[PDB]
Amino acid sequence: GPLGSLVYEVRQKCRNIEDICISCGSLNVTLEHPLFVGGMCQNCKNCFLECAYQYDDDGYQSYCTICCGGREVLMCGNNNCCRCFCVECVDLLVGPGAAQAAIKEDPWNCYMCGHKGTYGLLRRREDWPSRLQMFFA
């Protein structure tokens, strides 16, 4: 859906991030993203559950941790992690240029592994691990 302009409104403080699907931009929010503050639609949940921990022949997750898709992605360098974040989600949810800042960062701990927990509009849930296991059954 039209995520860019919805996030624009979130940034203007005239829409709540928890009332949009941060995975596709759908307004039909019936649940919560299990990793980050923000809504999620049923389509996106069905995709996550479907492309759950699929891996490419490079040893990394095939799809973006946020939107379960992505064209060009950033890869985490933290062993037991192997997650990917696409440049489109990063630039939209973290902020314009953050992806290139993170590519320049050497090495790079991804937003799932960082200590900080908040990165622009992208906010990690304190209870993500409980929420995540619950997500998968």
Binding site: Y60, R71, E72, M75, C76, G77, C86, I103, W108
Partner: peptide, 8 residues
């Protein structure tokens, strides 16, 4: 961070 393109 290293990058890759995906398999769309």
């Amino acid at each position: 961070a290293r990058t890759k393109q995906t398999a769309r």
